[PDB]
Design a protein around this ligand. Structure first.
Ligand SMILES: O=C(NCCC(F)(F)F)c1ccc(C#CCNS(=O)(=O)c2ccccc2)cc1
Ligand SMILES: O=C(NCCC(F)(F)F)c1ccc(C#CCNS(=O)(=O)c2ccccc2)cc1
Lengths: 192, 192
């Protein structure tokens, strides 16, 4: 479990410099101070290591969001949405290599794809429930179906956060991405 | 060139049923009514076939958008933005397998990635120029930097159009995706 954490730290450190395809099991064993068969005792494959790393990062974001949901900020609605979006900006932005590699793995691994899909459904359902609350309270007008609006806003964040972290061309500079998303969320949720 | 079109039609037809990884050069040659070495005369690889198919689809969208830019619809601004977004909805939605496969290839092929990147820069620059025109005319307020807003809106369309076409979970139903995007564009461009 000390050895399990070493393998995970090693893989995260190596993913900073090259993609999964260019990391071997022997690379992971060696960085973690173990042999190849001992590695295989903890994980069936390098792909299982990535899946665990992504799982931990996705769970970290999810728990931070649950914490925030229970403990709303005392501020205006634009700043509340910013604090929510910020959960993902900071959590995934603190783990850029796992983010990029976990995202590429969605194409090749059904476990990575299903993990992503489960959490995006949860985050979208929570986004729609808050939009519905805002509407029920008369702060937001009833425009699009809340679930469809929430779906597009979450997919926008996914693609736009992750492009910014990878410094893709094109992308929103990382120091501008938070304000850019919060503007689009607030205008599309509250705007007639 | 008759044989080149056959290879392209064959690959598009086969991509409807399986990914590129599961299509062989011999599969492409056989569907197009040629041998393997004759195939290799027209394309250096199955990846070069995908790149050409994506190139044709991206150019088709780009030209349709240029046509629209010169020949604006005579209608209210919400419907004008809808006609623009619709270029991509119809062009890429008419070529779903190429869209999905071209998008997966971005991870593995620098030519596919560079092609995508060039056109997204062009479409974003045109989006920002129209937003700037709307602002200059006093129809839209000066909120976010236009280029940053345009970048996020284009990345939203990319991810949300393509998720809907692939029937990803989660996604906006394809029959609702156009209205959903147009709402977010109009509110975020015109909303204070
Ligand atoms: O970015 C998101 N989803 C995509 C995640 C990604 F990027 F990692 F893919 C995201 C998902 C959900 C939220 C949210 C929220 C709402 N909670 S809230 O901000 O605390 C809030 C706002 C307004 C009133 C009450 C509470 C914000 C952002
Ligand atoms: O969807 C887009 N880009 C992403 C493409 C994708 F999805 F394939 F990745 C997209 C890019 C640009 C536009 C546009 C536009 C503006 N032209 S316009 O709609 O004709 C117009 C509107 C308002 C006033 C004047 C003209 C619309 C959509």
């Amino acid at each position: 479990d000390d050895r399990e954490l070493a393998i995970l730290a090693t893989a995260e450190n190596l993913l900073e410099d090259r993609p999964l395809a260019d990391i071997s099991v022997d690379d992971l064993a060696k960085g973690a101070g173990i042999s190849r068969p001992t590695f295989y005792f903890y994980f069936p494959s390098k792909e299982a290591v990535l899946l665990t790393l992504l799982d931990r990062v996705v769970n970290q974001a999810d728990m931070a969001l649950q914490t925030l949901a229970e403990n709303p900020a005392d501020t205006d609605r634009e700043n509340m949405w910013r604090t929510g979006i910020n959960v993902f900006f900071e959590t995934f932005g603190s783990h850029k290599a796992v983010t990029r590699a976990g995202q590429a793995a969605r194409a090749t691994s059904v476990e990575v794809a299903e993990l992503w899909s489960t959490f995006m459904q949860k985050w979208i359902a929570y986004t729609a429930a808050v939009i519905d609350a805002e509407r029920d309270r008369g702060a937001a007008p009833r425009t699009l179906p809340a679930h469809e609006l929430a779906t597009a806003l979450n997919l926008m964040n996914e693609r736009t956060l992750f492009a910014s972290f990878a410094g893709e061309q094109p992308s929103v500079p990382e120091a501008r991405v938070l304000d850019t998303l919060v503007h689009i969320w607030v205008t599309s949720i509250y705007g007639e």
